């Protein structure tokens, strides 16, 4: 009835309800390190998340979503393969069953544990809605997560989760500071995509970092016990809600670094 990451619904059933599943510049996909281009001319990132301000955080069943106030320029990105300014609307992970799996973008094949998706829209287009309907609209930071260590920053968002752990439930979430998720280096790899859950859409900048950041056991543990349902329905354990890596096609991966 809806879309899903189950057996019956999954990212390979995607394509009956949402043909774009099979265009040309679908994501996520594999970084081949050996044949990524360096392209010199690649500015650096700016990323301006100072007067940031989070709203709140909910589960909409497939996975969860920190909200951002985007009605003034508040947290920023610009520069890097960017034109023009693209506003902070909301950040979510992908993550899995079992450590070894969880990111959606993959690097020489290898798979991490998560994947922190940053969602930003292009300004010049007004609204959100607007910029869905352009070449490049949006543009996602996507992170990459490993076990080891805890992470101190990602601590307050662990300590919620017990709020909204089934579909629909939503906690008040103010004064969260998002510079607290950034590795120590900004260095990247940029190709034209889309989004990785329907519709789709195939108006995405993916702005993948090289340097993963750390998170501990018990910090995944606790993503693991989510929901994919509602109150009240049987229950159905929220992990794996990554899709498959898709075709290149004609496209190339270009690194802002040697
Ligand atoms: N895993 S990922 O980073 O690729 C991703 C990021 C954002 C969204 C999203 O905002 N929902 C869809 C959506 C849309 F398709 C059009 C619109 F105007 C608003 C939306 F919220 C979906 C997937
Ligand atoms: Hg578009
Ligand atoms: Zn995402």
């Known amino acids: 009835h809806h879309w899903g990451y189950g057996k019956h619904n999954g990212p390979e059933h995607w394509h009956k309800d949402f043909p774009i599943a099979k265009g040309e510049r679908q994501s996520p996909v594999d970084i081949d390190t050996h044949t990524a281009k360096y392209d010199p001319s690649l500015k650096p990132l700016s990323v301006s998340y100072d007067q940031a301000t989070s709203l709140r955080i909910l589960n909409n069943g497939h996975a969860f979503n920190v909200e951002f106030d985007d009605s003034q320029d508040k947290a920023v990105l610009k520069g890097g393969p960017l034109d023009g300014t693209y506003r902070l609307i909301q950040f979510h992970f992908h993550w899995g069953s079992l450590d070894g799996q969880g990111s959606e973008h993959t690097v020489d094949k290898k798979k991490y544990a998560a994947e922190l998706h940053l969602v ?59 510079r607290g998720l950034l590795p120590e280096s ?73």
């Not at 940029?190 to 910090?219: D, N």
Request: aromatic letters at 10%; hydrophobic letters at 35%; one cysteine or more.
């Open 120 to 178: 930003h829209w292009n300004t010049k287009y007004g609204d959100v809605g607007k910029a869905v309907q352009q070449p490049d609209g949006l543009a996602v930071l996507g992170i990459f997560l490993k076990v080891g260590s805890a992470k101190p920053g990602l601590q307050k968002v662990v300590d919620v989760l017990d709020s909204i752990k089934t579909k629909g439930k939503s906690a008040d979430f103010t004064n969260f500071d998002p």
């Open 186 to 258: 900004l260095d990247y790899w940029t190709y034209p995509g889309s989004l990785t859950t329907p519709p789709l859409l195939e108006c995405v900048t993916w702005i993948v970092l090289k340097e993963p950041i750390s998170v501990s056991s018990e910090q995944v543990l606790k993503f693991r016990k989510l929901n994919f349902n509602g109150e009240g329905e049987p229950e159905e354990l929220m992990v794996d809600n990554w899709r498959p890596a898709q075709p290149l096609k004609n496209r190339q991966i270009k690194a802002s670094f040697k």
